[PDB]
Short mmCIF file of all heavy atoms in Angstrom, two decimals:
data_model
loop_
_atom_site.label_atom_id
_atom_site.label_comp_id
_atom_site.label_asym_id
_atom_site.label_seq_id
_atom_site.Cartn_x
_atom_site.Cartn_y
_atom_site.Cartn_z
N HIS A 1 0.85 -1.16 0.01
CA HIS A 1 0.01 -0.01 0.00
C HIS A 1 0.88 1.23 -0.01
O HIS A 1 1.69 1.44 0.94
CB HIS A 1 -0.91 -0.02 1.24
CG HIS A 1 -1.79 1.20 1.31
ND1 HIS A 1 -2.24 1.69 2.52
CD2 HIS A 1 -2.38 1.96 0.37
CE1 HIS A 1 -3.01 2.73 2.30
NE2 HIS A 1 -3.15 2.88 1.03
N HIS A 2 0.72 2.08 -1.02
CA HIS A 2 1.35 3.41 -1.02
C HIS A 2 0.45 4.38 -0.34
O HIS A 2 -0.63 4.73 -0.85
CB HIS A 2 1.66 3.84 -2.44
CG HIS A 2 2.53 5.08 -2.53
ND1 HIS A 2 2.12 6.31 -2.11
CD2 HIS A 2 3.84 5.18 -2.93
CE1 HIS A 2 3.11 7.17 -2.29
NE2 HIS A 2 4.15 6.53 -2.78
N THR A 3 0.81 4.80 0.87
CA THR A 3 -0.04 5.64 1.67
C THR A 3 -0.19 7.06 1.06
O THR A 3 -1.31 7.61 1.11
CB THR A 3 0.46 5.73 3.11
OG1 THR A 3 1.85 5.92 3.10
CG2 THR A 3 0.16 4.46 3.86
N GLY A 4 0.87 7.56 0.48
CA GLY A 4 0.83 8.91 -0.09
C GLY A 4 -0.19 9.09 -1.21
O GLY A 4 -0.75 10.17 -1.36
N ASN A 5 -0.41 8.05 -2.02
CA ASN A 5 -1.34 8.09 -3.16
C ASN A 5 -2.55 7.17 -2.99
O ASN A 5 -3.40 7.16 -3.83
CB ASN A 5 -0.61 7.67 -4.44
CG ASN A 5 0.67 8.50 -4.68
OD1 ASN A 5 0.76 9.65 -4.26
ND2 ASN A 5 1.66 7.88 -5.32
N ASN A 6 -2.60 6.40 -1.89
CA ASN A 6 -3.62 5.42 -1.65
C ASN A 6 -3.82 4.50 -2.85
O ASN A 6 -4.90 4.36 -3.43
CB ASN A 6 -4.96 6.09 -1.28
CG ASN A 6 -5.98 5.12 -0.79
OD1 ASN A 6 -5.66 4.22 -0.01
ND2 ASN A 6 -7.20 5.20 -1.29
N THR A 7 -2.72 3.89 -3.26
CA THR A 7 -2.72 2.89 -4.29
C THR A 7 -2.18 1.58 -3.69
O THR A 7 -1.51 1.59 -2.66
CB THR A 7 -1.88 3.34 -5.50
OG1 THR A 7 -0.57 3.75 -5.08
CG2 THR A 7 -2.59 4.50 -6.23
N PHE A 8 -2.48 0.50 -4.37
CA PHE A 8 -2.10 -0.85 -3.96
C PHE A 8 -1.52 -1.60 -5.13
O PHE A 8 -1.92 -1.39 -6.28
CB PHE A 8 -3.22 -1.67 -3.36
CG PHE A 8 -3.88 -1.05 -2.16
CD1 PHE A 8 -4.80 -0.02 -2.27
CD2 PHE A 8 -3.57 -1.51 -0.88
CE1 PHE A 8 -5.41 0.51 -1.15
CE2 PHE A 8 -4.17 -0.96 0.25
CZ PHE A 8 -5.11 0.05 0.10
N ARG A 9 -0.59 -2.51 -4.85
CA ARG A 9 -0.12 -3.42 -5.86
C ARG A 9 0.20 -4.78 -5.25
O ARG A 9 0.41 -4.91 -4.03
CB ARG A 9 1.12 -2.89 -6.57
CG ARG A 9 2.29 -2.57 -5.67
CD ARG A 9 3.59 -2.42 -6.48
NE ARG A 9 4.68 -1.96 -5.64
CZ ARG A 9 5.97 -1.93 -5.98
NH1 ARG A 9 6.35 -2.40 -7.17
NH2 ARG A 9 6.90 -1.44 -5.15
N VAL A 10 0.16 -5.81 -6.10
CA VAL A 10 0.61 -7.15 -5.75
C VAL A 10 2.04 -7.34 -6.26
O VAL A 10 2.33 -7.11 -7.46
CB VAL A 10 -0.31 -8.24 -6.30
CG1 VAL A 10 0.22 -9.59 -5.94
CG2 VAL A 10 -1.70 -8.04 -5.79
N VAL A 11 2.96 -7.76 -5.41
CA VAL A 11 4.34 -8.02 -5.77
C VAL A 11 4.77 -9.35 -5.16
O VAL A 11 4.43 -9.67 -4.03
CB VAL A 11 5.26 -6.85 -5.30
CG1 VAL A 11 6.61 -7.06 -5.85
CG2 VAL A 11 4.78 -5.53 -5.82
N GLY A 12 5.51 -10.12 -5.94
CA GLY A 12 5.98 -11.44 -5.46
C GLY A 12 7.28 -11.83 -6.06
O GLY A 12 7.60 -11.55 -7.22
N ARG A 13 8.08 -12.50 -5.24
CA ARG A 13 9.38 -13.07 -5.62
C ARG A 13 9.41 -14.56 -5.33
O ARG A 13 9.07 -15.05 -4.29
CB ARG A 13 10.57 -12.45 -4.91
CG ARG A 13 10.84 -11.00 -5.31
CD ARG A 13 11.96 -10.46 -4.38
NE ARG A 13 12.40 -9.10 -4.73
CZ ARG A 13 13.33 -8.80 -5.62
NH1 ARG A 13 13.92 -9.76 -6.36
NH2 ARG A 13 13.64 -7.51 -5.82
N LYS A 14 9.91 -15.31 -6.36
CA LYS A 14 10.20 -16.75 -6.18
C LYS A 14 11.15 -16.94 -5.00
O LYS A 14 12.12 -16.22 -4.84
CB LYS A 14 10.81 -17.28 -7.47
CG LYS A 14 10.93 -18.78 -7.52
CD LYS A 14 9.58 -19.49 -7.72
CE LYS A 14 9.01 -19.34 -9.14
NZ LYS A 14 9.89 -19.80 -10.29
N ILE A 15 10.81 -17.91 -4.14
CA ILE A 15 11.63 -18.18 -2.96
C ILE A 15 13.03 -18.67 -3.38
O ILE A 15 14.03 -18.21 -2.79
CB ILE A 15 10.91 -19.21 -2.04
CG1 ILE A 15 9.70 -18.52 -1.45
CG2 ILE A 15 11.85 -19.72 -0.91
CD1 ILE A 15 8.70 -19.49 -0.79
N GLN A 16 13.13 -19.59 -4.33
CA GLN A 16 14.40 -20.26 -4.59
C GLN A 16 15.43 -19.29 -5.19
O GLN A 16 16.61 -19.39 -4.83
CB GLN A 16 14.18 -21.45 -5.52
CG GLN A 16 15.45 -22.22 -5.74
CD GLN A 16 15.21 -23.60 -6.42
OE1 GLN A 16 14.06 -23.93 -6.76
NE2 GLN A 16 16.28 -24.34 -6.62
N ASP A 17 15.01 -18.46 -6.13
CA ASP A 17 15.99 -17.63 -6.87
C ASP A 17 15.65 -16.13 -6.93
O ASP A 17 16.32 -15.39 -7.63
CB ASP A 17 16.20 -18.17 -8.28
CG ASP A 17 14.91 -18.21 -9.08
OD1 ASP A 17 14.00 -17.44 -8.77
OD2 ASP A 17 14.88 -18.99 -10.06
N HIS A 18 14.65 -15.70 -6.16
CA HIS A 18 14.30 -14.26 -5.97
C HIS A 18 13.72 -13.62 -7.24
O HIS A 18 13.57 -12.41 -7.26
CB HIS A 18 15.52 -13.49 -5.57
CG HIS A 18 16.32 -14.11 -4.48
ND1 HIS A 18 15.74 -14.66 -3.35
CD2 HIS A 18 17.65 -14.38 -4.38
CE1 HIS A 18 16.66 -15.20 -2.57
NE2 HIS A 18 17.83 -15.06 -3.18
N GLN A 19 13.35 -14.36 -8.27
CA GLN A 19 12.76 -13.78 -9.46
C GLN A 19 11.52 -12.97 -9.10
O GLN A 19 10.69 -13.47 -8.39
CB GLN A 19 12.39 -14.90 -10.47
CG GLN A 19 11.88 -14.30 -11.79
CD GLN A 19 11.31 -15.32 -12.75
OE1 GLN A 19 11.30 -16.51 -12.42
NE2 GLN A 19 10.94 -14.89 -13.93
N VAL A 20 11.40 -11.77 -9.65
CA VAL A 20 10.15 -11.01 -9.53
C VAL A 20 9.16 -11.62 -10.50
O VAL A 20 9.32 -11.49 -11.72
CB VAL A 20 10.35 -9.54 -9.81
CG1 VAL A 20 9.05 -8.78 -9.71
CG2 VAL A 20 11.41 -8.92 -8.88
N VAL A 21 8.10 -12.25 -9.98
CA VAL A 21 7.17 -12.98 -10.83
C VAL A 21 5.86 -12.24 -10.96
O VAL A 21 5.04 -12.64 -11.82
CB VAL A 21 6.92 -14.39 -10.36
CG1 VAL A 21 8.20 -15.17 -10.42
CG2 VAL A 21 6.37 -14.42 -8.94
N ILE A 22 5.55 -11.23 -10.15
CA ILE A 22 4.35 -10.45 -10.29
C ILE A 22 4.58 -9.09 -9.72
O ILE A 22 5.29 -8.92 -8.71
CB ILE A 22 3.13 -11.18 -9.66
CG1 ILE A 22 1.83 -10.38 -9.90
CG2 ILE A 22 3.40 -11.38 -8.15
CD1 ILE A 22 0.58 -11.18 -9.57
N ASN A 23 4.08 -8.08 -10.43
CA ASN A 23 4.20 -6.71 -9.99
C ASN A 23 3.08 -5.97 -10.70
O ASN A 23 3.26 -5.37 -11.76
CB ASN A 23 5.57 -6.08 -10.35
CG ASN A 23 5.74 -4.68 -9.81
OD1 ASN A 23 4.92 -4.18 -9.05
ND2 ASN A 23 6.85 -4.05 -10.16
N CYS A 24 1.88 -6.02 -10.15
CA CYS A 24 0.70 -5.52 -10.85
C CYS A 24 -0.12 -4.64 -9.93
O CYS A 24 -0.32 -4.97 -8.74
CB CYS A 24 -0.12 -6.65 -11.45
SG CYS A 24 -0.82 -7.77 -10.23
N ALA A 25 -0.64 -3.55 -10.50
CA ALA A 25 -1.47 -2.63 -9.76
C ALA A 25 -2.78 -3.31 -9.43
O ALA A 25 -3.26 -4.21 -10.12
CB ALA A 25 -1.73 -1.38 -10.59
N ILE A 26 -3.40 -2.86 -8.32
CA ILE A 26 -4.76 -3.29 -7.93
C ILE A 26 -5.64 -2.08 -8.17
O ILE A 26 -5.70 -1.19 -7.28
CB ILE A 26 -4.83 -3.77 -6.48
CG1 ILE A 26 -3.84 -4.90 -6.26
CG2 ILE A 26 -6.25 -4.18 -6.15
CD1 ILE A 26 -3.73 -5.28 -4.73
N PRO A 27 -6.35 -1.97 -9.29
CA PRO A 27 -7.17 -0.80 -9.51
C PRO A 27 -8.48 -0.81 -8.74
O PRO A 27 -9.01 -1.87 -8.37
CB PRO A 27 -7.45 -0.84 -11.05
CG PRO A 27 -7.00 -2.14 -11.53
CD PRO A 27 -6.38 -2.92 -10.40
N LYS A 28 -9.03 0.37 -8.54
CA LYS A 28 -10.32 0.49 -7.93
C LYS A 28 -11.32 -0.28 -8.76
O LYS A 28 -11.28 -0.21 -10.00
CB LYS A 28 -10.69 1.99 -7.80
CG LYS A 28 -11.97 2.25 -7.04
CD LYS A 28 -12.17 3.75 -6.88
CE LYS A 28 -13.23 4.07 -5.80
NZ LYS A 28 -12.97 5.34 -5.11
N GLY A 29 -12.14 -1.08 -8.12
CA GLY A 29 -13.16 -1.83 -8.86
C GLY A 29 -12.74 -3.26 -9.25
O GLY A 29 -13.58 -3.99 -9.80
N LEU A 30 -11.51 -3.64 -8.96
CA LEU A 30 -11.03 -4.99 -9.36
C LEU A 30 -11.94 -6.06 -8.73
O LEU A 30 -12.28 -6.01 -7.58
CB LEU A 30 -9.59 -5.15 -8.91
CG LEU A 30 -8.93 -6.50 -9.13
CD1 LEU A 30 -7.49 -6.33 -9.47
CD2 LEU A 30 -9.06 -7.35 -7.88
N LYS A 31 -12.25 -7.08 -9.55
CA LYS A 31 -13.00 -8.24 -9.10
C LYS A 31 -12.03 -9.34 -8.76
O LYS A 31 -11.34 -9.90 -9.64
CB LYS A 31 -13.95 -8.69 -10.23
CG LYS A 31 -14.86 -7.57 -10.69
CD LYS A 31 -15.73 -7.05 -9.55
CE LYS A 31 -16.91 -6.22 -10.08
NZ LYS A 31 -16.43 -5.19 -11.07
N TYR A 32 -11.99 -9.72 -7.48
CA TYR A 32 -11.09 -10.76 -6.96
C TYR A 32 -11.88 -12.05 -6.75
O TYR A 32 -12.74 -12.08 -5.88
CB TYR A 32 -10.43 -10.27 -5.70
CG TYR A 32 -9.41 -11.22 -5.04
CD1 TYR A 32 -8.12 -11.35 -5.57
CD2 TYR A 32 -9.75 -11.91 -3.88
CE1 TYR A 32 -7.25 -12.21 -4.95
CE2 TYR A 32 -8.84 -12.77 -3.27
CZ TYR A 32 -7.57 -12.89 -3.81
OH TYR A 32 -6.66 -13.72 -3.21
N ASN A 33 -11.60 -13.05 -7.56
CA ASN A 33 -12.40 -14.24 -7.60
C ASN A 33 -11.72 -15.31 -6.73
O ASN A 33 -10.64 -15.76 -7.09
CB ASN A 33 -12.59 -14.74 -9.02
CG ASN A 33 -13.53 -15.88 -9.12
OD1 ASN A 33 -13.16 -16.98 -9.53
ND2 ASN A 33 -14.77 -15.68 -8.65
N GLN A 34 -12.39 -15.74 -5.67
CA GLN A 34 -11.93 -16.82 -4.85
C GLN A 34 -12.51 -18.10 -5.39
O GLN A 34 -13.49 -18.65 -4.89
CB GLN A 34 -12.26 -16.60 -3.38
CG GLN A 34 -11.62 -15.30 -2.84
CD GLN A 34 -11.90 -15.02 -1.36
OE1 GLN A 34 -11.77 -15.92 -0.53
NE2 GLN A 34 -12.29 -13.83 -1.04
N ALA A 35 -11.88 -18.59 -6.48
CA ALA A 35 -12.43 -19.72 -7.20
C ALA A 35 -12.53 -20.98 -6.32
O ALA A 35 -13.52 -21.72 -6.36
CB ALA A 35 -11.59 -20.03 -8.45
N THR A 36 -11.48 -21.27 -5.54
CA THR A 36 -11.46 -22.28 -4.53
C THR A 36 -10.84 -21.76 -3.25
O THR A 36 -10.31 -20.63 -3.23
CB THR A 36 -10.68 -23.55 -4.98
OG1 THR A 36 -9.27 -23.24 -4.95
CG2 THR A 36 -11.07 -23.97 -6.36
N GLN A 37 -10.78 -22.58 -2.21
CA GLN A 37 -10.18 -22.12 -0.95
C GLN A 37 -8.70 -21.83 -1.06
O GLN A 37 -8.09 -21.17 -0.18
CB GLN A 37 -10.38 -23.15 0.16
CG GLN A 37 -11.80 -23.25 0.69
CD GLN A 37 -11.89 -24.19 1.90
OE1 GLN A 37 -12.37 -25.34 1.79
NE2 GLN A 37 -11.37 -23.74 3.04
N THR A 38 -8.02 -22.35 -2.09
CA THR A 38 -6.59 -22.12 -2.24
C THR A 38 -6.21 -21.60 -3.59
O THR A 38 -5.01 -21.48 -3.86
CB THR A 38 -5.83 -23.45 -1.98
OG1 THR A 38 -6.35 -24.44 -2.84
CG2 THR A 38 -6.01 -23.90 -0.51
N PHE A 39 -7.12 -21.28 -4.50
CA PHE A 39 -6.81 -20.72 -5.79
C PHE A 39 -7.68 -19.47 -6.00
O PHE A 39 -8.88 -19.61 -6.14
CB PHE A 39 -6.96 -21.68 -6.95
CG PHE A 39 -6.46 -21.11 -8.25
CD1 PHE A 39 -5.11 -21.15 -8.57
CD2 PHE A 39 -7.34 -20.47 -9.12
CE1 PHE A 39 -4.67 -20.61 -9.78
CE2 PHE A 39 -6.89 -19.92 -10.32
CZ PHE A 39 -5.55 -19.98 -10.62
N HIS A 40 -7.05 -18.29 -6.02
CA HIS A 40 -7.73 -17.02 -6.24
C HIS A 40 -7.15 -16.37 -7.48
O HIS A 40 -6.00 -16.59 -7.84
CB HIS A 40 -7.60 -16.08 -5.05
CG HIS A 40 -8.08 -16.65 -3.74
ND1 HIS A 40 -7.85 -15.99 -2.53
CD2 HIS A 40 -8.72 -17.79 -3.43
CE1 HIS A 40 -8.37 -16.73 -1.55
NE2 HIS A 40 -8.90 -17.81 -2.09
N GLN A 41 -7.97 -15.52 -8.12
CA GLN A 41 -7.58 -15.00 -9.42
C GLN A 41 -8.22 -13.62 -9.69
O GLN A 41 -9.23 -13.27 -9.07
CB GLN A 41 -8.00 -16.00 -10.56
CG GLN A 41 -9.50 -16.22 -10.61
CD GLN A 41 -9.98 -17.30 -11.62
OE1 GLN A 41 -11.04 -17.89 -11.47
NE2 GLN A 41 -9.14 -17.60 -12.59
N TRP A 42 -7.59 -12.87 -10.59
CA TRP A 42 -8.12 -11.60 -11.07
C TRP A 42 -7.58 -11.26 -12.45
O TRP A 42 -6.64 -11.89 -12.93
CB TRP A 42 -7.79 -10.44 -10.07
CG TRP A 42 -6.32 -10.13 -10.01
CD1 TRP A 42 -5.66 -9.16 -10.74
CD2 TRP A 42 -5.36 -10.72 -9.18
NE1 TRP A 42 -4.35 -9.19 -10.41
CE2 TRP A 42 -4.14 -10.13 -9.42
CE3 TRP A 42 -5.42 -11.74 -8.21
CZ2 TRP A 42 -2.97 -10.50 -8.76
CZ3 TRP A 42 -4.24 -12.11 -7.54
CH2 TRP A 42 -3.06 -11.45 -7.81
N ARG A 43 -8.21 -10.29 -13.08
CA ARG A 43 -7.97 -9.90 -14.48
C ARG A 43 -7.15 -8.60 -14.53
O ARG A 43 -7.34 -7.72 -13.72
CB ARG A 43 -9.27 -9.67 -15.25
CG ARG A 43 -10.19 -10.86 -15.39
CD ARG A 43 -11.48 -10.46 -16.08
NE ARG A 43 -12.28 -9.50 -15.28
CZ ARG A 43 -13.45 -9.75 -14.72
NH1 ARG A 43 -14.03 -10.92 -14.88
NH2 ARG A 43 -14.05 -8.84 -13.99
N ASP A 44 -6.33 -8.48 -15.57
CA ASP A 44 -6.01 -7.17 -16.13
C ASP A 44 -6.07 -7.32 -17.67
O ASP A 44 -6.34 -8.39 -18.18
CB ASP A 44 -4.65 -6.63 -15.60
CG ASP A 44 -3.42 -7.09 -16.37
OD1 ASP A 44 -3.54 -7.82 -17.40
OD2 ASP A 44 -2.32 -6.70 -15.98
N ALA A 45 -5.84 -6.19 -18.35
CA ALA A 45 -6.02 -6.18 -19.80
C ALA A 45 -5.07 -7.17 -20.50
O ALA A 45 -5.40 -7.67 -21.59
CB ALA A 45 -5.76 -4.75 -20.34
N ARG A 46 -3.94 -7.46 -19.92
CA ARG A 46 -2.92 -8.29 -20.55
C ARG A 46 -3.10 -9.76 -20.23
O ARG A 46 -2.90 -10.63 -21.08
CB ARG A 46 -1.53 -7.82 -20.15
CG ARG A 46 -0.35 -8.56 -20.81
CD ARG A 46 1.02 -7.91 -20.51
NE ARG A 46 1.56 -8.32 -19.21
CZ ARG A 46 2.63 -7.80 -18.67
NH1 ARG A 46 3.26 -6.76 -19.21
NH2 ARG A 46 3.06 -8.26 -17.47
#
């Protein structure tokens, strides 16, 4: 959470080799689908 702009993003690194594997904004209105108890998903244009 960026407090100065009130924006959010998802960021993740692989444990084994530190690869940045996700770095995506969370826009206002995003639909977060909890498809199962352990698999959740969301859309962007790409």
Side-chain angles (χ1 to χ4, degrees):
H1 180 209
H2 191 293
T3 43
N5 307 330
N6 190 45
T7 52
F8 299 80
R9 57 164 173 170
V10 178
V11 187
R13 289 174 177 276
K14 190 75 72 58
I15 292 166
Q16 183 168 2
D17 57 27
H18 313 315
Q19 185 188 0
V20 179
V21 297
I22 184 166
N23 185 6
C24 63
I26 303 171
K28 186 174 195 150
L30 175 146
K31 305 300 195 310
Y32 181 78
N33 187 241
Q34 299 181 48
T36 72
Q37 287 186 255
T38 56
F39 186 83
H40 305 171
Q41 61 187 157
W42 68 93
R43 300 175 293 249
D44 86 3
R46 183 172 84 190

